[PDB]
Amino acid sequence: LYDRRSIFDAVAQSNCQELESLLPFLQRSKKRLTDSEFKDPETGKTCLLKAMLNLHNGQNDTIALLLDVARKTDSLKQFVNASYTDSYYKGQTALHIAIERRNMTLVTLLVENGADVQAAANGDFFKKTKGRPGFYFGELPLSLAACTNQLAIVKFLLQNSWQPADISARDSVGNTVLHALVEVADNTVDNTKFVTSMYNEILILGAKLHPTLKLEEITNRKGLTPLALAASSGKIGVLAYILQREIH
Ligand SMILES: Nc1ncnc2c1ncn2[C@@H]1O[C@H](COP(=O)(O)OP(=O)(O)OP(=O)(O)O)[C@@H](O)[C@H]1O
């Protein structure tokens, strides 16, 4: 037998043995790894998510086993895609965390077992500090992966076989990855530099993958193109960058 507590402890120490008798348990009781009872009743955290927090050296194979179990009952999709429900981390999925942790291997794994690449992490933890904070990138995996300057994962999100990212999706505020990048600028020289070329990179990928899309024309919920946001919020280095590119 297994209660929520039993597994969460097993996960905490990366124990793949105490979960030997796992699969056969919810075969008898036909319980699901996704049942109400197997989540924290106030956050919506699952064992996979506990595993995501309890990393040791960016590794945990309780994950690999946990996923494996979910397919055998085919809890698979809704398991890998369960989100936080507390006001703080609301809408955060395991894929968000893998990226937050800069972990290709776990991004790769989650996407292959069908992580939703468009899932919006929209809780107060993913918007501007109360101050609380903090920190906004907004919302969507691609946006995250860019705003944290993680090119390879930006590429893997957009290019993968399993679910390519929608490069033009808008977060709750209307912002696309180009909008979010403008928001993440802070007018320091190294800041400009990284935003500026990640921006460049996104456009190069837009034009390579989906040529019809006029990315820089897309307005956030306040009617602002990325450029116009840049200028509304005194993000000058980037403003200068965006206009200089249009000039060629
Ligand atoms: N996206 C995140 N990034 C960084 N830290 C996070 C994130 N989400 C949650 N945390 C931190 O990890 C903690 C949860 O860690 P863990 O999953 O080990 O929970 P616990 O409360 O120690 O154990 P249990 O869930 O078994 O009671 C949260 O309280 C929070 O401080």
Side-chain angles (χ1 to χ4, degrees):
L1 290 90
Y2 291 90
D3 56 28
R4 174 172 48 103
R5 186 25 86 205
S6 214
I7 293 159
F8 274 38
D9 293 348
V11 166
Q13 19 147 43
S14 284
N15 209 34
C16 272
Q17 267 192 325
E18 284 342 283
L19 305 162
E20 302 178 358
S21 217
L22 184 60
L23 166 73
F25 160 75
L26 44 183
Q27 281 179 340
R28 207 270 106 106
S29 55
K30 279 147 233 140
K31 280 173 152 74
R32 294 290 177 98
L33 217 42
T34 57
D35 282 358
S36 165
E37 106 202 67
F38 292 119
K39 313 171 299 223
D40 175 19
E42 50 221 305
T43 60
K45 204 214 308 199
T46 61
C47 32
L48 199 218
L49 275 166
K50 169 89 172 186
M52 286 304 150
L53 287 326
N54 301 244
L55 285 167
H56 93 292
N57 277 319
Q59 300 230 320
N60 206 338
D61 33 30
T62 259
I63 300 163
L65 177 148
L66 250 41
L67 294 149
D68 167 76
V69 181
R71 198 150 179 156
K72 308 281 194 189
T73 306
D74 295 310
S75 320
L76 188 263
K77 261 218 144 218
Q78 68 264 206
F79 177 64
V80 91
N81 284 324
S83 45
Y84 275 87
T85 55
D86 67 315
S87 70
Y88 199 54
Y89 293 120
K90 185 189 172 199
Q92 180 174 58
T93 62
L95 186 55
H96 289 108
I97 303 180
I99 308 179
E100 280 157 83
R101 296 290 181 275
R102 328 186 77 80
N103 200 329
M104 184 55 243
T105 306
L106 292 205
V107 153
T108 331
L109 188 74
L110 269 18
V111 154
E112 291 204 13
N113 305 284
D116 179 25
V117 138
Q118 295 305 131
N122 64 57
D124 294 321
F125 175 67
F126 310 106
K127 307 181 324 148
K128 253 206 267 172
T129 194
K130 153 158 151 65
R132 240 222 109 164
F135 137 92
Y136 161 85
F137 52 80
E139 316 219 345
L140 307 148
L142 210 195
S143 289
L144 182 55
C147 287
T148 69
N149 193 2
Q150 296 191 81
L151 216 189
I153 309 193
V154 168
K155 281 183 181 152
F156 178 83
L157 282 163
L158 290 163
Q159 305 194 354
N160 74 80
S161 332
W162 305 86
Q163 187 172 358
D166 172 344
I167 201 174
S168 67
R170 270 146 39 99
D171 77 6
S172 87
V173 139
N175 286 344
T176 60
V177 212
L178 301 184
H179 292 308
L181 274 169
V182 175
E183 209 81 40
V184 108
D186 70 12
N187 303 297
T188 66
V189 163
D190 298 314
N191 163 254
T192 280
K193 189 184 176 210
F194 115 75
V195 174
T196 247
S197 74
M198 175 65 41
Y199 195 91
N200 184 59
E201 223 60 51
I202 287 296
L203 288 180
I204 291 162
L205 267 33
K208 198 177 74 175
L209 265 21
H210 314 281
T212 38
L213 284 319
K214 282 183 155 166
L215 252 30
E216 286 176 281
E217 302 185 337
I218 307 170
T219 67
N220 74 7
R221 261 174 186 276
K222 281 191 215 173
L224 305 173
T225 66
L227 175 89
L229 210 211
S232 65
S233 56
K235 307 278 158 89
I236 274 113
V238 185
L239 191 171
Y241 177 81
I242 291 165
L243 283 155
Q244 175 66 31
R245 252 189 67 124
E246 287 178 13
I247 287 170
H248 331 103

